Amino acid sequence: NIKVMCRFRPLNESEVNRGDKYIAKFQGEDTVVIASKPYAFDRVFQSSTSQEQVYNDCAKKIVKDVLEGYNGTIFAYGQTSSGKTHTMEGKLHDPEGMGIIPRIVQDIFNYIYSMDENLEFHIKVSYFEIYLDKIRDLLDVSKTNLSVHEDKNRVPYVKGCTERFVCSPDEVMDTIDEGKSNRHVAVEHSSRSHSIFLINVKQENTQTEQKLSGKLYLVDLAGSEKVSKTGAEGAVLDEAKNINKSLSALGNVISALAEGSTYVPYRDSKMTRILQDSLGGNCRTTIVICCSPSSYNESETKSTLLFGQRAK
Amino acid sequence: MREIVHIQAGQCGNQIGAKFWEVISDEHGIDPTGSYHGDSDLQLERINVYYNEAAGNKYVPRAILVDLEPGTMDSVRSGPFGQIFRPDNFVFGQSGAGNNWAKGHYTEGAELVDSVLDVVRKESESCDCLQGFQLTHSLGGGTGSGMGTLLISKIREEYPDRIMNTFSVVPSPKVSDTVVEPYNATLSVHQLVENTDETYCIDNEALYDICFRTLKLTTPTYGDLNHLVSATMSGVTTCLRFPGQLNADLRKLAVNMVPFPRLHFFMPGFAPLTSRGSQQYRALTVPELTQQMFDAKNMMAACDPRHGRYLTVAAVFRGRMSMKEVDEQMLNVQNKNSSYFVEWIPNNVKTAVCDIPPRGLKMSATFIGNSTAIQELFKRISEQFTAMFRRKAFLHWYTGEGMDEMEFTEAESNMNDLVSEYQQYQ
C-alpha cells in the first residue's frame, strides 16, 4: 500500500537571529495544521525525531520484503534546505547521524553475512537520471539517450544501462559518490533533474534450485518551482516545465493507484513507465516529504504538503 | 507569422497533398504558374502561412514531397499544378519499399532521411515564427508508414515544442488491397500514439459510403475521396489566415479537445454535402448544418458514434451567421442527446466562427470529434494482427531487414493499452 511520511526540521543557528517563528502545529502523531487548515497523513515526524526512528518506521519493511524476492520503492521530495540530504544521505560514517541509504546497505549486507553457506547472492547497482525527458547514465557519461522496452513478461526495464557488481558497503558508497558527481545541479546545490538508483539482489539456492529476484528503488524527486515568482529564462524555464509536468504525472499515477481505478495511467511519463513493476499490485512503496517550519518558507512548505496530500 | 511546413510521404500522401494544394490555391486565388490573379485583399493578407515569396510576384508552396519510388513524383510533376513546387524539394530514391514497414523505417529510409531533414531545416529557418508541421500519409503502406514515422521522430527530436498534426488513412475492414496491412498499421500506431500532438483518422470505406449514399455518385474514383479529405484539411485551419468573430488556433483546438495526453485521435467531418439536382429543394441555415454534422452517416471514419460517447467536439463555422443560433444549437444538441456525451465534462462542444465562406457556398462547417467509438477500429486491427502473428505468417521479410519480434509485441501492448484507455470513460 501507499504510505506518506512527513518530516520537519529545526530552526538552525544561521536563521534564528532573524527572528523567524514556527508555523507548524501538531495534534497527536498524524495531523499537522498550518493556518488552521488540517493535513492528514500516515505519520508526521517532529524536530526531535532521530534518524533511527525514521528508518525503522519508513523503510525497514520494504528492505525486508526485497530480501524475500519482492519489490520496493522509496521516494524523496522536498525543496532546497528542507532536510532532504540529511534524511537521505547525511554523514556517511557516523553511527548516529547517518542517513537512510547507509542504514539500507548496512541491513542488506548484515543478512548476507549470516545466512548459512548454501545460498549464493549477487548485488547489482545502476544509476540513471531523467533530464529533459531523456534518460542519461550517471555511471557512464558516454551514454546519453537510453530507451525503455518490455521483455516477454511485459515487465519494463532500461536498455543499455550500465550495471556493475559490488562486494562491500564501501563499493556501494563509492559508486554512489561517483554517480552523484555528474548530476545536474544549478547554482545552493539545487537539483534540476530526477534521479533513480537501483539495488538488485538475486539469490539462487544451491540445494533447492529455486531462484528469487528482488529490486529496491531509490528515487530523488526534484522540487516543483513556481515560475511566475522567480523569472526563469532559457534553460531554467525548460527545466522547470519538465519537472512540474513529471511531478504532476507521478501524482496522477499514485492517485489512480490509491483510489482503486480500473485503469491506471502508467504511460503518461518516463518515470512511472520505468517503475511500473514496483508500484502497483503486491508492492509496498513509501514516500518521504521534507518540510521547513520557518515562516520564511510557508509557500514552498504548503506546496510540498499539497503534493503529499494529492496521493492519499 | 504562424507558418506551416507541409510534408507528403508515399503515393496516397502525395496525391492527397496535390489535391489539397490545388484546393488551397483556388481558395487564395493563385494561378498554376504561381502568380496572383485574385479579387480580394484578404487572399494576400495572410498568404505567408502556406506560401513563400519569390522574385516578380511569384509564390512557391512550403511543401516537401518524399517517396522511395520515382513514379508518383513524375506523376505529380505532370499534373495541372506541377509547375508550382520547388524542384529542389523533391527527394526520392530508386528501390521501392515493397509494402515493407521494416524496409522503409530501417534500411532504405535511413539512407534518405538525411536529405529530407536537410530540406526541412532549410525550409524552417526562413520562417518568422513557426506554428507546426503537417503530414499526409497512409498507415497501411510500406514507404508512407515507416518514412513518415521516422520523419516524425526526427522532427519531434529537433523541434520539441511545435504542433504536429498528421492526416493518416486507416485500413478498413471490408476494403483492403494488401495482405500485410495489420502489421504496418500496428507498427505505425505504436509511434503515432507517442510522437504526435493531434492525428486525424480517415478510412476509405466511410468515404465510399458517403459518395454512394449522400452524394448519389454512380462510379466514384480516388479523386473524390482525396477531394473530401482536402476539403476537411482546409477547413481545419481556416482561422489562421482569415478574420472572424471567434478565432481558434491549432494549439487552441489541441487544448480544448485533448483531456489526457494519449487521447488525440479524431474523426473529421464536413457539411453541407448534397447531390447535384437536389440542392434547390434544401434550405441552408445553421440548424441544417448542425443536424447534418451530428449524423452517423457523415463521419469519415468507419465507426458508429452511437456505440459510445463523445469527449470533446469542435465545430468550425465559415460564413455570416448569428452567434445565438450557434450557441442554442450546440446546447440543445447536448441536451437532446445527453446519453451520447460524457457527463462529467460540461460544454463538450467548442464553437469557432469565421466570416469567409468557401467559394460557391453561403455557409460551411467542419466537424472534429473525439469519441470512444474509435476503439473498435483498433480492436479489428489488433484482432487481425493476433490472427496473423500466432503462425508468424509473412514475418521473415521483416526480420530480414533487422527487426525483432519484440517490436511487434511492444506495438500490440501499446495498442491494447490505448484501447483500454478509450473504454474507461464509457
Add this chain to the structure above:
Amino acid sequence: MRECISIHVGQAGVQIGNACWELYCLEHGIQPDGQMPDSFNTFFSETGAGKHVPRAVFVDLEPTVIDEVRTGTYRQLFHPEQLITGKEDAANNYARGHYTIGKEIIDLVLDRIRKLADQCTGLQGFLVFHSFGGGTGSGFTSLLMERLSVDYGKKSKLEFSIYPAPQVSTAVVEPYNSILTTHTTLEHSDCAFMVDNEAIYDICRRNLDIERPTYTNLNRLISQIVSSITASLRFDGALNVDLTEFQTNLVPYPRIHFPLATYAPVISAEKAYHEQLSVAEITNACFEPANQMVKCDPRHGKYMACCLLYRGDVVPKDVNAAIATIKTKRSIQFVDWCPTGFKVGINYQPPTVVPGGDLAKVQRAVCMLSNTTAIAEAWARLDHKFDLMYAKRAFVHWYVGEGMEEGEFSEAREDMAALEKDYEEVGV
C-alpha cells in the same frame, strides 16, 4: 482636468473598444480621421493641427483583430504605437497569457501606459475591458493589473468583464480560467462589473424584437452603459457624480465591490411610439428580474446600495416620486442597516443614436448600478462546474506544462468560497 485611460486586452475587449470609440466619436462630433468640423478632453487630446488622439491602448497576443483595426475605417485615429501585437495567442491557457508569452510585450505596454499618464494632469482612473475564460483576458490582465497596482497604486481601476453563462458556453476550459482570473481580480481592482451573453440575448429577443442577435448588439449595449457612466465627467447637469463619489456611495465594505448593471429603456423603433416612457415607467422597469444583464433574479436576495444615473429630460420631483413608489413596494427588499440606499445623478445630455443601430431615439434613459446578494448564484454554478471538471483533473497537463503549479487551482477555489461566504454573511 478630468481624464481616464482605456485599456482593451483580448479579442472581446478589442471589439467592445471598437464599439465604445465609435460611440464616443459620434457623441463628441469627431470624424474617424480625427478632425472635427471642453467636454472632449476626458477621452482625447489635441495635437496642434486639429487632430484628436484617443487615450487608449489595444493589446493582444494574436495579430488578427488588431490588424482588422489597422486596416478598417478607424485606421487614421489611433496612434500606431498604441496598437500592440505579439506573435502567438494564449490558446486558452492562463499560464501562456500570464508568463510564458506575457514576458515579451509587457514592458512595451507599461511604457505606453507611462507615456499616456505622464501627459495627463488630473488623472481619474483606468478603464479595463476583458473577458473571463480566454487565456489572454484571464492571464495577461492579471499581470498588467499587478504591474499597475505596484506602479500607480492610489489610482482607481474599473473593470468591465464578460462572465461565463450558465448553459451557453464556447470553450471547454472556461471554468479554470474564470476561477483564476476571479481570484486575481479581488486583490487589485476597485469596482468590477460583470455581464453574460445569455441575458443580453434574452433582452434583445424580448425588448428589441430581434431573433438572431450577434456580438455587435451586445457591444453596443455595453458601450451605452459605459457612456452613461462617464457622461457625468464629460457633460454638465444637476447632481453630477464622479468616480470617487460612486465608490463611496456604492461599496460598503472593501471586498463587496461587485455590482450588476442595467439599462433602460431598451426599445425598438416600432415600440418607440405607442408608449409613454415617463420617468416612473423607466424607473420601475429597471427593477424587473427579466431586464438584468446577469442571469440572476434579484428577488432571491437583498439590495445594499443602488445608484440611479438619469440622463436627458429629468426633473428631481419625478425622481423622488418614483423612488417613493419603489420604496413602498414589498417584493424589493433592502437591508435593515441601510435606511437610505439611493444615489441620484442627472445629466442634461440625452443619449445618442448610432446609425445602423437597434435602439431608438429616446428623450431620456436611466442606468442603475446596484450590488445585491443575488450575485453569488453565478459564482456557485461556476464553482460547481470547476469542481466537477477538476475531480478527474482534465486538461490540467496543458497548464502545468507552462510552469504553473497545481496549488493555484485549490487556492483560487478557496478564495472564491471565501468571497461567497462573505457575501452570504453580510446579506443577513
